[PDB]
Amino acid sequence: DTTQQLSLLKHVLSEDKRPIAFIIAAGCPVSIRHNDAPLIPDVAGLTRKISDSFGGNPDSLLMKIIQNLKTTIPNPTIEDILSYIRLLQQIPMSGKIHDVENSVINALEESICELIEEEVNVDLPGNATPYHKIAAWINSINREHQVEIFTTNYDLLMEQALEELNVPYFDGFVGSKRAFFDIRTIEENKLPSRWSKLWKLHGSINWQLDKQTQTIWRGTPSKGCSLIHPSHLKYDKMPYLVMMDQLKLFLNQPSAILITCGYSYKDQHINEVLSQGLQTNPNALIYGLQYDVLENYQEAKDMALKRSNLILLAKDRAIIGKKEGEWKPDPQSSQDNDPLLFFKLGDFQHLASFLEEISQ
Amino acid sequence: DTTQQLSLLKHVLSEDKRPIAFIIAAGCPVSIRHNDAPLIPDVAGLTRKISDSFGGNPDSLLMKIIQNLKTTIPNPTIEDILSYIRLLQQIPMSGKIHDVENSVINALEESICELIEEEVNVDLPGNATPYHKIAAWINSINREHQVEIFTTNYDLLMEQALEELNVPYFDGFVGSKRAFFDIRTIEENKLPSRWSKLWKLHGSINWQLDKQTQTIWRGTPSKGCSLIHPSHLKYDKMPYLVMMDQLKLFLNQPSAILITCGYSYKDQHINEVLSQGLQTNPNALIYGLQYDVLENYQEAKDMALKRSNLILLAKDRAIIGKKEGEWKPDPQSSQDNDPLLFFKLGDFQHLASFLEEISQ
Amino acid sequence: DTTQQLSLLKHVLSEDKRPIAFIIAAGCPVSIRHNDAPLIPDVAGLTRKISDSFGGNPDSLLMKIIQNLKTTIPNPTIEDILSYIRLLQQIPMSGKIHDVENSVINALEESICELIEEEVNVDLPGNATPYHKIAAWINSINREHQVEIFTTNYDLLMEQALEELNVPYFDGFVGSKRAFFDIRTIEENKLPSRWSKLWKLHGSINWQLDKQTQTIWRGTPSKGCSLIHPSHLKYDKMPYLVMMDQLKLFLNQPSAILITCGYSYKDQHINEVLSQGLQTNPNALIYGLQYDVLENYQEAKDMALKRSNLILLAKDRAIIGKKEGEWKPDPQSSQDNDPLLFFKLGDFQHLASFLEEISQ
């Protein structure tokens, strides 16, 4: 099954008459090897670091909140904890839920934000990283349709890689000193055709908010970024709806394509916007790829079974147009012992190799 | 001054080359006189009746909630109370804030919904009501641009008036038995040019939700309608964002017009969407009219002073393109005593008379 | 004969350049199996249960009327009984024909109306019913020509199946509270091309009449629906002529197609409108299919023998262009005993399977 999918992917990517996009999740940053350790320990890692940082003491508010969430959420995460804490802050919660913290909840969330900021504030080492290969592919060939990239991460790796190889892009903000969030140009949609576009759905580490005018601006990472929010903030002093609107508006164009790398389809709003855009535009496609085994992704299988234009591919099997298929007999593993049919090409490093092979 | 604005409104409404809209708030239902009493006691009455219904006993949860809200917001209302109760429901609030009601908060909100449903579930008496006059104006002349109506009320007066005079309209839902919320046709925007469109921003009394499939549908008013929400519900099993997108998308059309009757600009989301639409489309106009005195409307003054495409008119003064003007010397009141210059036409009955005169 | 007709039907249905229609009679509701019993016992059942409901007592008016009709009508039915009763009450029939019932005829027709109402007031069980498959076929592919459905039944199965699978349609009425019968839009014929159209020729259980203004409207099934009339009512406070006219007007577009399922051609008006429209447009086709043996249908054979563009098909033989043919030798039944050549595809469940196969 490797040959057919590889060839068709080559054909669809080689054409320059179709829009292309990406979705980048924690899989891409974790795929970078450093000191035989993950560059960023992903959502589970960033959750466990907070859990161990405050220790196992039951007197801590954060451990109490985690065990409270265990009753409702089987596997609570940092996103859920942050949303829960912000929610508790929204109302004068002086009750027994916050009896231990009459006002220490603000300090707890402040420390969580600071530690996340310290953890994800790194840079790309060297010029052999996969992001450099991806940017090289992007600027290798001039195409009449712009290449967009959607990022659910907080790190600035992709911006750095796009600047080092000198690929222009527009991420929403326009300006030099304290770039503001320009709105009109976003929906004019008449940027130069050579530009890429980098949308950050979940915010970033450098976004900040000035409460004096209650307006946001992209600057430099300072002590506490107030738009670290994983899509949990105020009403439309908020660009989240606009980035989602941009994803949706992108999906509705004819012969649209999309590729997800490192996404586990565990976020509801992304999933429903993908579903809406996918049904509203039959021509829309999602060539979602999972580095993990498909058996761990019930949500992905449900999505694939509900729509016919979602060519979901996994490590072991594949779902091509509401029908599920497995790997055909091929000598994927030369060794006789454990002849596992694994599609190793779904790894992000291997994906970058694939793109650079296409480009050259 | 009356002559200039009256004539220009007549000319701009008489033309059929421009889109027209309305925004209808509690002022329109309250302007109907019945038994020398208000037909609907408006938001202040709708709140005070609820407060008096549970009595002045401090043991009641609702009064404790009201006094809790007094500490943060000076003037709590039914919308704020409902949002606050729903918010408290969102997390396992078993603490001292909800110590009195371990689980009685759900009962409290259920009773609030039932009582408000009983209060706003009435019908139009006779055929002399102003809504009938407005519908007569709408169907009096065929215009190449559809006339839309945005309603923030919960009553079904507008639908009944449009039905009795046989004016077709599309309110989002398509079907007969238990009509679903059709999404695609909303954004295709290719309905017959004769149809009006009636959008319900704050929900309505007949919308209901089935939790088995977590999908909404408009049917008949049963005991407990789960979409009474004044824009406080789940993520996009929710039509609120779609109606908001429709308001925005309408505002961006060339030479767009809008009229607000009974609106006090006391909702932040409505206000910011109006402002953003005004900015993105300078040609957009808002001929907002207030029945009350201008001195009570700080938000209206602010919006009118920071934008130029908003010809706000009040009972006493007017704001025409970022410049504030008052009533010029005219014999508005014949009586010598208290020669108050009041633009009395801003009341909804007088507005209906004005439209009737224009149509005939 | 199976292969050729099956292939030709596949080709004619697969094309998106032609109008398509359906006619749905009691065969489709009865084809549903429930508790090893018919979901609706069809016209014979709905007549015999009325007969047994009033018992075998000769003192009953209804039994007297049935035996009176036996003299003229060999096999009287519920339609004939209802028409006869409405005729009897149309004039002051105080004579010996109504000597037993000075005023009890109104009570008799009432009780008949409610009894029919409860007997036909059911819902679709599950999601494996054939109607769901038909709607899935309808919305499976976008076609430039709208798919209409004509129904002679009183049940609301088709509406429920269409709206559960998110299929829009227009059944004549426009509105939300008490949807009125809009006339102009019916003949404008400029609805969005994506919409289906569901016409109810024989009325329905939810249509009602307000005598204060003598106007009809679709609402919710209440106690006694005054428009269950099987095309026997007042003059043009009556939409029957309009739906008949709509069938006629549909027959006149070029390359028009039509399929009847469960129809026995026992209605004079439908038969003559089919014949006349088939005369006027020789390009019109009717692929009438009978689940029963053709020998029971003299009317269908007569009509097929009068016209060349009516490819009538039966269980045993077929009539293709005024020439009658029988089943060619094929191993339809594997068993040697009773090698009956029966076209099993004429059953409605099998038709739903056929449409599902075409769609997939």
Side-chain angles (χ1 to χ4, degrees), chain A residues 1-51 53-56 58 61-89 92 94-95 103 106-231 239-290 292-294 296 299-314 318-325 329 331 333 339 343 345-360, chain B residues 1-51 53-56 58 61-89 92 94-95 103 106-231 239-290 292-294 296 299-314 318-325 329 331 333 339 343 345-360, chain C residues 1-51 53-56 58 61-89 92 94-95 103 106-231 239-290 292-294 296 299-314 318-325 329 331 333 339 343 345-360:
Chain A
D1 290 338
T2 60
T3 295
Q4 293 178 356
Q5 277 65 242
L6 260 57
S7 179
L8 61 83
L9 283 186
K10 172 172 178 178
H11 295 105
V12 299
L13 288 192
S14 303
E15 296 297 325
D16 55 356
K17 64 90 176 179
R18 285 188 94 186
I20 307 103
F22 268 72
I23 285 186
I24 305 311
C28 311
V30 65
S31 285
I32 286 177
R33 304 311 310 101
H34 207 83
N35 301 319
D36 292 331
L39 176 52
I40 293 188
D42 296 336
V43 59
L46 277 296
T47 305
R48 194 221 41 61
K49 296 188 82 167
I50 301 299
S51 69
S53 177
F54 280 65
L61 272 299
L62 190 147
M63 261 313 315
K64 290 184 177 180
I65 296 302
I66 293 173
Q67 66 89 30
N68 190 1
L69 290 188
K70 252 73 178 174
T71 66
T72 70
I73 302 176
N75 183 225
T77 191
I78 177 65
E79 314 166 352
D80 291 331
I81 296 169
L82 263 170
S83 309
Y84 182 76
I85 296 167
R86 275 212 184 69
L87 183 63
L88 281 175
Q89 187 276 348
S94 66
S103 165
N106 313 339
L108 192 147
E109 63 92 20
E110 282 294 329
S111 312
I112 284 186
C113 295
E114 299 302 340
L115 191 153
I116 291 301
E117 168 150 2
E118 300 321 297
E119 289 292 328
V120 304
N121 220 353
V122 299
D123 55 354
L124 280 172
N127 284 41
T129 48
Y131 296 98
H132 289 88
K133 307 181 181 177
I134 287 188
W137 176 80
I138 290 160
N139 68 354
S140 66
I141 303 300
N142 193 16
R143 327 160 207 263
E144 71 205 350
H145 284 170
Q146 296 177 48
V147 171
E148 305 195 5
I149 296 168
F150 308 89
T151 315
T152 81
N153 312 309
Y154 314 81
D155 198 332
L156 314 179
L157 308 182
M158 187 66 204
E159 298 151 356
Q160 174 176 346
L162 283 149
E163 306 156 0
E164 270 188 7
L165 281 72
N166 297 115
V167 191
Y169 62 91
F170 174 70
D171 66 327
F173 294 73
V174 172
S176 43
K177 196 184 177 173
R178 303 144 49 120
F180 58 90
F181 186 61
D182 192 79
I183 308 166
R184 318 182 41 191
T185 307
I186 300 187
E187 63 256 13
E188 304 306 342
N189 190 17
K190 64 179 73 175
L191 283 170
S193 178
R194 216 185 59 91
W195 289 48
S196 304
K197 298 180 173 177
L198 171 79
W199 307 114
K200 289 257 184 187
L201 313 168
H202 287 199
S204 294
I205 66 178
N206 51 5
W207 293 10
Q208 305 196 193
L209 170 58
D210 278 316
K211 315 274 209 312
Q212 315 93 32
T213 71
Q214 283 288 130
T215 59
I216 64 168
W217 49 266
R218 175 259 300 291
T220 44
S222 66
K223 187 52 71 174
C225 53
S226 297
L227 281 56
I228 193 66
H229 63 81
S231 165
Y240 175 64
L241 303 162
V242 180
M243 314 282 150
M244 294 296 172
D245 185 74
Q246 277 306 133
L247 160 62
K248 172 191 85 212
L249 193 150
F250 155 72
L251 260 186
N252 296 350
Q253 313 154 260
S255 72
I257 319 168
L258 197 149
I259 303 176
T260 75
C261 196
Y263 195 32
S264 44
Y265 309 88
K266 294 181 176 67
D267 186 74
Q268 49 166 24
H269 202 178
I270 296 289
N271 283 296
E272 69 182 62
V273 167
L274 294 174
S275 79
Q276 272 192 20
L278 190 65
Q279 65 182 357
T280 301
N281 207 16
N283 304 114
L285 317 173
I286 289 180
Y287 294 10
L289 319 174
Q290 309 310 112
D292 47 350
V293 67
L294 73 164
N296 285 318
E299 281 287 333
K301 288 194 200 72
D302 193 2
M303 189 71 115
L305 290 182
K306 298 291 180 68
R307 303 296 178 188
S308 61
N309 55 3
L310 191 137
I311 308 174
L312 194 159
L313 312 182
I319 308 179
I320 312 182
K322 271 202 257 214
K323 64 102 176 178
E324 173 167 347
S333 56
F343 298 156
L345 297 180
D347 199 2
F348 182 75
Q349 309 278 341
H350 293 80
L351 181 62
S353 187
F354 174 27
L355 277 296
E356 67 92 17
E357 288 294 330
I358 295 302
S359 78
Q360 63 89 29
Chain B
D1 289 337
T2 60
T3 295
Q4 293 179 356
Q5 293 82 17
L6 261 59
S7 179
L8 62 83
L9 287 155
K10 172 173 179 178
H11 295 105
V12 68
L13 287 191
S14 303
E15 297 297 325
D16 50 349
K17 284 93 174 172
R18 285 189 94 186
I20 307 103
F22 267 72
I23 286 186
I24 290 171
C28 310
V30 72
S31 285
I32 286 177
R33 304 311 300 101
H34 206 83
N35 302 319
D36 293 331
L39 176 52
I40 301 299
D42 295 335
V43 61
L46 260 57
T47 304
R48 184 221 61 51
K49 298 189 81 170
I50 284 290
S51 66
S53 296
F54 279 65
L61 272 299
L62 189 148
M63 187 66 204
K64 179 220 83 162
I65 294 301
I66 293 174
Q67 63 84 30
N68 191 1
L69 290 189
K70 252 74 176 175
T71 66
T72 70
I73 62 170
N75 290 318
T77 190
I78 176 64
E79 315 166 353
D80 291 331
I81 297 168
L82 265 170
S83 309
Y84 174 21
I85 303 149
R86 264 163 171 113
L87 183 63
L88 282 174
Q89 193 283 350
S94 66
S103 165
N106 313 339
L108 193 148
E109 66 93 20
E110 283 295 328
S111 313
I112 300 300
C113 295
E114 301 282 29
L115 202 173
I116 193 64
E117 167 150 2
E118 300 321 297
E119 295 275 70
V120 298
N121 218 353
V122 298
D123 55 354
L124 290 173
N127 284 41
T129 48
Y131 301 93
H132 287 89
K133 307 181 181 177
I134 283 174
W137 176 79
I138 297 169
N139 71 351
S140 66
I141 304 299
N142 193 16
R143 281 81 58 85
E144 75 201 333
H145 285 170
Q146 296 177 48
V147 171
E148 305 194 5
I149 295 170
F150 308 88
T151 315
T152 178
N153 313 309
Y154 314 90
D155 198 339
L156 313 177
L157 310 182
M158 182 38 60
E159 299 149 355
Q160 175 175 345
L162 286 154
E163 288 165 6
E164 272 186 6
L165 272 78
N166 300 115
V167 191
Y169 62 91
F170 174 69
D171 64 327
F173 295 72
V174 171
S176 44
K177 194 185 177 173
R178 52 182 290 167
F180 56 90
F181 186 63
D182 191 78
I183 308 166
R184 310 192 32 191
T185 308
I186 300 187
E187 62 256 12
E188 304 296 4
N189 190 42
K190 57 176 69 175
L191 282 170
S193 178
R194 285 194 53 271
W195 289 48
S196 304
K197 297 181 172 178
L198 171 78
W199 305 114
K200 287 251 182 187
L201 308 167
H202 282 100
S204 184
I205 67 178
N206 50 5
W207 294 9
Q208 305 195 193
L209 189 152
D210 279 317
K211 315 264 209 302
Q212 315 93 32
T213 71
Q214 283 288 130
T215 59
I216 64 168
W217 50 266
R218 166 204 79 203
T220 44
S222 65
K223 294 328 306 173
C225 53
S226 297
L227 279 59
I228 193 66
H229 63 281
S231 164
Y240 175 65
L241 305 162
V242 180
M243 320 284 148
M244 277 320 182
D245 290 25
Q246 277 306 133
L247 162 61
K248 182 175 65 36
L249 192 150
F250 155 71
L251 259 185
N252 295 349
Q253 283 147 9
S255 72
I257 320 168
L258 198 149
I259 303 176
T260 76
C261 183
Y263 196 31
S264 45
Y265 310 88
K266 289 182 173 66
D267 204 86
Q268 60 104 9
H269 201 177
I270 298 287
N271 283 295
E272 70 182 64
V273 166
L274 301 153
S275 79
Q276 165 176 334
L278 294 174
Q279 272 164 210
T280 301
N281 185 340
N283 303 114
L285 318 174
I286 289 180
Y287 293 10
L289 319 174
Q290 308 310 111
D292 48 349
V293 68
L294 183 62
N296 284 319
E299 284 288 333
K301 286 194 200 73
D302 291 331
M303 171 96 78
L305 290 183
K306 271 75 72 176
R307 293 303 323 281
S308 178
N309 49 0
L310 188 152
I311 307 174
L312 190 151
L313 313 182
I319 307 179
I320 312 182
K322 271 203 257 214
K323 64 102 175 179
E324 174 168 348
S333 56
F343 299 130
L345 73 165
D347 200 2
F348 182 75
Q349 309 278 341
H350 293 80
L351 176 59
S353 188
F354 174 27
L355 277 296
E356 184 175 359
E357 294 296 327
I358 294 301
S359 78
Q360 180 59 256
Chain C
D1 290 338
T2 59
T3 295
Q4 293 179 356
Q5 272 56 69
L6 260 57
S7 178
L8 294 174
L9 288 195
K10 171 172 178 178
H11 319 315
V12 299
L13 288 192
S14 303
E15 297 296 325
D16 52 349
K17 66 182 290 294
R18 285 186 93 185
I20 307 104
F22 268 73
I23 285 187
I24 306 311
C28 312
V30 68
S31 285
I32 287 177
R33 304 320 300 111
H34 205 82
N35 300 321
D36 293 331
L39 175 53
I40 295 187
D42 296 335
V43 60
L46 277 296
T47 305
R48 74 151 80 101
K49 312 163 82 163
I50 300 299
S51 67
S53 177
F54 280 65
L61 272 299
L62 189 147
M63 192 46 257
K64 290 185 176 181
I65 295 302
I66 293 173
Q67 67 90 30
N68 191 1
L69 290 188
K70 252 73 178 174
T71 66
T72 70
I73 301 176
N75 183 225
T77 191
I78 192 66
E79 315 166 353
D80 291 331
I81 297 168
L82 264 170
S83 309
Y84 182 76
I85 296 167
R86 271 152 169 163
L87 261 173
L88 282 174
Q89 63 84 30
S94 66
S103 165
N106 312 339
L108 191 147
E109 63 90 20
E110 282 294 328
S111 311
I112 284 186
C113 294
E114 292 84 4
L115 198 150
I116 293 301
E117 169 151 1
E118 289 94 9
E119 294 277 80
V120 305
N121 220 353
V122 298
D123 55 354
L124 279 171
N127 284 41
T129 48
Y131 296 98
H132 289 88
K133 306 182 181 177
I134 286 188
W137 176 80
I138 297 169
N139 69 353
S140 66
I141 303 300
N142 193 15
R143 283 82 58 85
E144 61 186 340
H145 284 169
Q146 297 177 48
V147 171
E148 304 195 5
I149 296 170
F150 305 87
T151 315
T152 81
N153 312 309
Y154 324 111
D155 197 326
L156 304 175
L157 298 176
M158 181 36 48
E159 300 153 358
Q160 173 176 346
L162 284 154
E163 58 189 52
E164 271 188 7
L165 281 72
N166 176 215
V167 191
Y169 62 91
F170 176 70
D171 64 327
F173 295 72
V174 171
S176 44
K177 196 184 178 173
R178 303 144 50 120
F180 58 90
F181 186 61
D182 191 78
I183 308 166
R184 298 178 66 190
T185 308
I186 300 187
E187 62 256 12
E188 304 296 4
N189 185 33
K190 64 179 73 175
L191 282 170
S193 178
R194 216 186 59 90
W195 289 48
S196 304
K197 298 181 172 177
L198 171 79
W199 308 113
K200 290 257 184 187
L201 311 168
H202 287 19
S204 294
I205 66 178
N206 51 4
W207 293 10
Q208 305 196 193
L209 170 58
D210 279 316
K211 315 274 209 312
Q212 315 92 32
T213 71
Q214 284 288 130
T215 59
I216 63 167
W217 49 266
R218 190 206 50 221
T220 43
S222 65
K223 195 43 42 193
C225 55
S226 298
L227 272 75
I228 193 66
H229 65 278
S231 165
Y240 176 65
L241 305 161
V242 180
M243 317 283 168
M244 281 324 317
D245 176 342
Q246 278 307 133
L247 161 60
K248 180 176 70 67
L249 195 150
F250 155 70
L251 263 184
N252 294 350
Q253 293 82 18
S255 72
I257 319 169
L258 196 148
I259 303 176
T260 77
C261 290
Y263 195 31
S264 45
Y265 308 87
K266 292 181 175 66
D267 204 85
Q268 50 166 24
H269 200 177
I270 300 291
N271 282 296
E272 72 181 65
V273 167
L274 294 174
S275 80
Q276 164 178 333
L278 190 65
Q279 294 179 177
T280 300
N281 202 320
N283 304 112
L285 317 172
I286 288 180
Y287 296 163
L289 319 174
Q290 308 309 111
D292 48 350
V293 67
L294 73 164
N296 285 318
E299 280 286 333
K301 288 194 200 72
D302 189 359
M303 171 86 98
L305 289 182
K306 299 291 180 68
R307 304 297 176 190
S308 60
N309 56 2
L310 190 150
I311 306 175
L312 200 159
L313 312 182
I319 306 179
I320 311 182
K322 271 201 257 214
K323 63 101 176 178
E324 173 167 348
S333 56
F343 295 155
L345 191 141
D347 200 2
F348 182 75
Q349 309 278 341
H350 294 80
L351 180 62
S353 188
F354 174 35
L355 273 296
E356 183 284 300
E357 294 296 327
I358 296 302
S359 78
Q360 64 89 29

